[PDB]
Structures are given as C-alpha cells and as structure tokens.
C-alpha cells in the first residue's frame, strides 16, 4: 500500500527556487529509481528528473543546469530545487515511484498544482526413511544459460519416465505435475548457479532415480543436457 | 428386400472447382464399388422410406419417365423445412418448405396436406433430364449447409447387361440449394416397368483422375481389394510387378476430434498494445499470460500494425499452435535499428540493451506512430544504455546504475573524463526522417514446456468418441487411430532415443485429467504383392510376422500369406516374397510359392 505524500506549491514569483517535498510512505520504496515528471493541462506529461538508487540523479538536457536534487541524509528527501524559476514551467508536478513500468507497476502521486563444460553433477545420500522430508542439489559447471527451463525427471528402471519440476528461465513461476501438487518444490538460485529440490513426506511409490536435465523452452520438445543420477530408496 | 451390384456407379465431383489433369484424393462421401445395394423392382408400393445416412445415389433405367420426383425430410411430420420437387409435365419447381406427405407418394397436388412458413425456392427452368430404356442417375446429399444435387443423365445402351451399365461415370453438379436444413429420411414421388437403384454414400477415401477437358478418366475406391488398397498408396492408377505396403486404408476414419482449447474468457492482450507511455530502453517489462484462450483475429483488423515478422514459427496458422506460457514484453526504440530485433542480430540495442537467443520461437510486433507521443517541446523522457564493459546475456534485466569506466584508470565514481554515465537520454521529435521514429516494439515470446497447455487457439471443441477409428489433433500432434480409456497411469515421456524414428502410444486429455491410449486401427505391415494389372487382377497379401492369425496358408519364418500355394520345386527368383523365398506367374495362370533355388 504505497501512499507517498507530496507537498510544496502555491503562488510563486518568476525567479527563485521551488522547494518541493516528495516523502515516501515510511517504507523501503527507495530501493529502485524514482522519478519527477511534470504534466501540463491538456497534454501528455513531460519527464523532468530521475533519481537512481545508487546516489545518482539525471535531468533532461533541455532543462539542464537549472535543477538539483539530493538526499544526503538517507531519509525521504526529494526536494528537487528548481533554480531560475519562471512562468513557463508552471504546471502540475507529482513524483512517481518508478517511471519505467507504464501502467504495469507505476504509482503516480496525488497532485500538487502550482500557480504563478556441460558436466551437470548431482548429489544425494542413500536410502530414505519411509515417510519424511529430504533435499537434493544439482550443480552446473560452466553453465550460464539462465533462460533454459529445468526439470527433475524420474527415470527409474521398470515403468516409464515422468516430469515433476519446471523452472521458467524467462519467468520463474513454479510449474508442478498433477501427482506432486502438495509435494517437493524447486528453486533456481542464480547466485551459485545450482538447483535445489526440497523434498517432503514421501510414500513407497516415490522410489525413483531422479536426474537433473535442462533444456531450451524454445525449439524441440526433448532435453539437451543430462546429469549423473541419484537414488532415493524410500523403504 | 434384395441385393445387387453397384460397380462403378456413385462417383461424383467432390467440389465445384474445374481443374485440369489433377489427382483428387479427398476423403468425402462416396459409394464403394461392388457394394450390396438394394434393387427395388416396380411394375406397386414396394419401396419404403429409405434411410438417408450420408447421401442417396438414385438411378433408373426406363423410358417415358414416371418416377421423377424425390421426397426429402427429417421426420416427414411437418416439423422441419422439408424438400419437394414438382416436375409433373413442364413446370419443374424445387420447393424448400414443410410439406405433410401422406401415404400416397404418387400424384395432382394431393401429396401434401397444406402449406406453412416456407423458404427460398429454386425457379430452375432447365428440365431435369420407342428406342430403348434410357438411364437417369442422381446424387443427393447435404454438407456444410449446401444441398448439392448431381446428375449425369446420358443415353444408355439397349439393355446389354440388364442390371447396371459398365464404364466409368461422373455425375456433373446439377444444382446446389443454399438451404442448410438437415435431412434424415428419404423417399420418392411417383409421377403417375422401372426400377429403383439406391445406395448409401458411406464415408471412405476415394481417388480420382481428372483431365484437361473436365471429364474424369479413372477412379479407385481404395477399399475393395488389397490391390485397390495398394493402388491408392503410390498416387497412381497403373501397377506393375512388385510388392508394396499400405497405411490404414482398410479401415477409414469416421469422425474428427480436436478438443484444442478449454477456456472461453480472453486475456488482456491489448493492454500491452494500446496504453500510456511504455517502458524505457534500459528496462523492459514482462507480463506472463496465464490460463486463457488466444484470439489473434482482433489483433489483425483492429489497430493495423506493421509487418508481422515472426521468426522460428510460421507467420501464419497461429490460431492452431498452442503453447504453455506466452510472455509479452514492452519496448520503444529509434526507427533506425529495429532490424536488430531479429534473433542472431548485432548492433547497439541488440548488444547492450536487449539480446535475443539463437532459438527464439516468438514474434515481433510494432505500431510505430509519432502521434501519441513526441510533442513539440524537446523530448528527453526515454533513456537507453550507453555502453557496457561486458557482454549482455539474452533475456536478462539490466537494472543497474554503476559508474561506467572506459579509461586506462578506474574513475571510482566521479563521472568525469571517460567516466560517462551508462544511461543516455533519447530525442524523439515529430518532425524528422524515418530513421528517428519511436517504434513501440514488442517481442511476444512463445515457448513450449512440459506443463499442461494454458492458452490455446480460438477454435471450438468437439465431443470425445471412445472405441472408434478417428483422427485427433490435441496439441499439434495429429494422429489417426483408436482412443482407449485405459489405466496406464504415470504418462510416458519417452525421449531416450531423441524421437528420431518413433511414434507415440498414449496421450493426456487437454480438457480434463484423463489418459487416452492410442492404438492402430488395422496394421501389422500388410504388404500386397501385385504382379501387375496388365497380366491379371489377382494379388496376394503378406504380413511381416506379427500374429499369423488375422483377427492356402503356409508357415515360414517370414509371417503368413494368403492367396497362393507352396511348391516343393525350385525355380528362378522373380518376385521376392520374403526370407529369400520368391514367386512367379506360371500356368491355371496364378502365383506359386516355390522354394528359393539356393
């Protein structure tokens, strides 16, 4: 519930420093880049300034060397001191949390009108207790394709092979199968480039020979890279 | 009740296209050859209401035509719009209206009771066409709301076969009523030594041979004899010495099932196309479409976009291929490097702003227009990545404002000489060339996963049929066979041999959680040995050792064959049957199974 406040406005004389105040909603909404955009009546708004989270600011080359903004106190300080005021820039002003996600993730202000190398090794222990959680890991040496999709397929001898996990490389939404709905989940840690399968209470039918196979979401319907294999004897 | 032969009688034109010397093998409604059809002998009321399964092939050999009209209707109870043909003396009228036909099919307007809310009527003036008894034949059917009637009234010979004439015929399209009412029953109207020759146009696969003049020379039914089955496998009409296989021609598909989609409510696909100012160049949004139904028809006529350059997949037929997840991006770049959006391209925005993988089965879209934006004030709202010391990975966000360094020494965050910020603003003026126009490009990424389909095409959904040889196209995998409701849980995902030469065995229902086992209707490697139609018209079959008992036969280590006899003698190998054994054609004149002269 972002409820940032904006203050500062009213009658002003051409020539001076307009002191605004864009305060956050006492939260951590300053982790990304905020923006200050000016909107004139009867026309689309015009961007003015952009404050990046890494202690940086950027103004438009048109209105250059006439406006400054800085925090310098690790608090909600977005004064945006506009130097050399006039009557042409008199319009509507409102700060936005991020002017880079139009109509998708942006939150406008209220409004203040102014006047004037393919080794996919695996892990795992041995037998598993008849009912109980577990955890398996899969490492990827010399692998940087962060857009491929992952899966934990079970190819134990006897019956056929199945599909359980699905990690969208372009996305990240967890897609499970029908028999593993309330079962182990997956997580793609992009820091160390590994795969984590946090198991849960398994039954006698969960005994399999799960692998760690990755493939490309665009192209064919088969896999591209294999692993070494792990055994989970639930008995 | 009686049966008779209907050889080479019932072949018509499937469509109205006037081709020239083509090969037509469309599976439409036809009457198979040598079919036991009914022959009604009239001198009285002997012919009852005939069942209209899929069409009626009527015929009569007589002079001074007294059987001219035909009674159509669904139930003949004044419920649906029936059909009547009144051609008593000179006024031929085809009326599509509800007529209550009594028990007197003969004439003279006492056949019907009264009139009702009628419909369109054909005013065709051409008449429906002591020497001999001429032959008149007609074909009646109704498909796709078109009541097509075919006729090939031609002078017949003077009672040569006395049952049905020889030679091939092809009934030219007589008329085509645009009414779409359904007909289930069939009868006739007596206009008072004739004969009623009717049949059932059961669905099968037929092959025809057209000519440059318009007439059809040859036609094969592909369902009569193994030689007829083999003739429709080489796309020809003459055969010679050899042995050839078939593919599911002895059993023909009955219906067609698709069941592609399962959702009726559309998704907000237009929110990314028509909205306020989109994202910048250094940052790009990504909306993940979910369980929905895709309707690309509204994106074609409404809001005319630019060229639909689709890479990886076909640019058309996008209303049938269904995927699992479909991601929608957002972007706006200058109109001088948009060509770099294609996969495998390089440049400025394709190297440090947004990269594309080598395999991208999506499609780009653009609606460049400087009317919604680019006011005359000085445009510096959009920014783009200036430079990067490293290479960009495809499909990777670049939200970072680190001080870019390009000099011999690190700047340590001072923004000075050779320490420019990696984000530079853009300039989009409404008065400029084509190379400075804001292209609001969007790369719709279509990928396929192992998850159930969530958003398919806008087609309809048919009903599931159990224990029947039909065709099914669930998720692009077209298959002809029989679906069985089995208990083979844990759906197979066979990909060990990379599916080089292998077919599927079972599928999952895309509508509800179900398993459908796919079984071939009739197979087993049925190879027919044809010595050639020039010598005779007798062939034999052979199976590649499947069962030797299909649910004059000799037992060898190659299967079982029917239509020959084993000879203990040995001769020269002429036609290799299998496992070294060969056959020939010697005197009665037939084929034998002599031992190979080893």
Author numbering:
A (entry chain B): 1 to 116, 139 to 257
B (entry chain A): 26 to 68, 78 to 141, 156 to 177, 182 to 244, 262 to 620, 641 to 676, 689 to 699
From the paper:
We first explored whether a previously reported bispecific single-domain antibody bn03 could resist the immune escape of the SARS-CoV-2 Omicron variants by neutralization and binding activities. Analysis of mutational events across SARS-CoV-2 variants revealed that the n3130v domain of bn03 contributed to its exquisite neutralizing breadth. This domain was found to recognize a cryptic region located in the spike trimeric interface. In summary, our study defined a highly conserved epitope on the trimeric interface of viral spikes that enables broad antibody recognition of SARS-CoV-2 variants including the Omicron subvariants BQ.1.1 and XBB, and emphasized a unique mechanism for antibody neutralization via inducing SARS-CoV-2 spike trimer decay and disassembly.
Bn03 could broadly neutralize all the six Omicron variants, with IC50 values of 0.69, 0.36, 1.50, 0.10, 0.59 and 0.74 μg/ml for BA.2, BA.4, BA.5, BF.7, BQ.1.1 and XBB, respectively, which is comparable to that of the five SARS-CoV-2 variants of concern (VOCs Alpha, Beta, Gamma, Delta and Omicron BA.1, ranging from 0.11–0.76 μg/mL2). Other than that, F562 and F565 of SD1 form another hydrophobic interface with V37, L45, Y95, A97, F107, W110 of n3130v, which is not observed in BA. S trimer-bn03 complex, the S1 region of XBB S in S monomer-n3130v complex undergoes large conformational changes, inserting F562 and F565 residues of the SD1 domain into the hydrophobic groove of n3130v and thus providing stronger interaction between S1 and 3130v. The n3130v epitopes on RBD and SD1 are highly conserved between the variants of SARS-CoV-2, including WT, BA.1, BQ.1.1, XBB, XBB.1.5 and the newly discovered XBB.1.16.
